[PDB]
């Protein structure tokens, strides 16, 4: 296992009213990247908590209220496209042996180098680890078929990609969803995808579908440097 006990230090568990909502990825002490679809249905939420660290007594576990969630203007509930959310924590996490961010790579490096690494590491939820075989660009249009839908957003082939394969449902989809798809290169791990339609989700056999993070790098950096605004859930223009 790449990560100790299959628990990657950048993995985040998102809870609402103490119940599992989705997973996420820490990219620095204050920002977490997850999936927009995790916020499709909101009713009677008393909070939104990000949990990090060792979870499997008190040992190296940190929790943080999520101050704000930002989704792109191009995202449409129900459509498997532009599935990404940027979360700002009220207070920074403290980095430790069990809490470390995953690097958000530069766009060019991600497109020229990371996009060609054969396998990637996907983390989900207890923490789970899974090495997956990325589906080459040429086969993307075909692997995205099951995700396709009439009247949906254009260029799904550009903003989403596939990796690995799922044959049956597993009790782990909640935290799995919105979780990290990391790619290794010369000793360092980088964020390359966000679990959109993960393994262990649904009963039908399907490719794992992930949001291509390289298409959102500039957008994420723009959001992180912007002046703070009021509100807990906002739609920001994309690009």
């Amino acid at each position: 296992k790449v990560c100790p006990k299959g628990e990657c230090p950048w993995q985040v568990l998102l809870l609402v009213n103490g119940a599992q909502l989705c997973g996420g990825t820490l990219i620095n002490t204050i920002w977490v990247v997850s999936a927009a679809h995790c916020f499709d249905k909101i009713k009677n939420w008393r909070n939104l908590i990000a949990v990090l660290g060792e979870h499997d007594h008190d040992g190296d576990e940190q929790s943080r209220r999520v101050a704000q969630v930002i989704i792109p203007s191009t995202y449409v509930p129900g459509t498997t496209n532009h599935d990404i959310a940027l979360l700002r924590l009220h207070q920074p996490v403290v980095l430790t042996d069990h809490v470390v961010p995953l690097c958000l790579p530069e766009r060019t490096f991600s497109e020229r180098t990371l996009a060609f690494v054969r396998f990637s590491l996907v983390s989900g939820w207890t923490a789970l680890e899974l090495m997956v075989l990325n589906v080459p660009r040429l086969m993307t249009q075909d692997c995205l078929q099951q995700s396709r839908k009439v009247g949906d957003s254009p260029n799904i082939t550009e903003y989403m990609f596939c990796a690995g394969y799922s044959d049956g449902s597993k009790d782990s989809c909640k935290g799995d969803s919105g979780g990290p798809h990391a790619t290794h290169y010369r000793g360092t791990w980088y964020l390359t995808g966000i679990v959109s339609w993960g393994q262990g989700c649904a009963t039908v056999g399907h490719f794992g579908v992930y949001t291509r993070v390289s298409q959102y790098i500039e957008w994420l950096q723009k959001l992180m440097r912007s002046e703070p605004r009021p509100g807990v859930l906002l739609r920001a223009p994309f690009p």
């Binding site: 909101i42 008393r46 223009p237």
Partner: peptide
């Protein structure tokens, strides 16, 4: 730039 606010607080959030 202009962002659309969907919820002010978690307690008053509906989506």
């Amino acid at each position: 730039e202009e962002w659309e606010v969907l919820c002010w607080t978690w307690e008053t959030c509906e989506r």
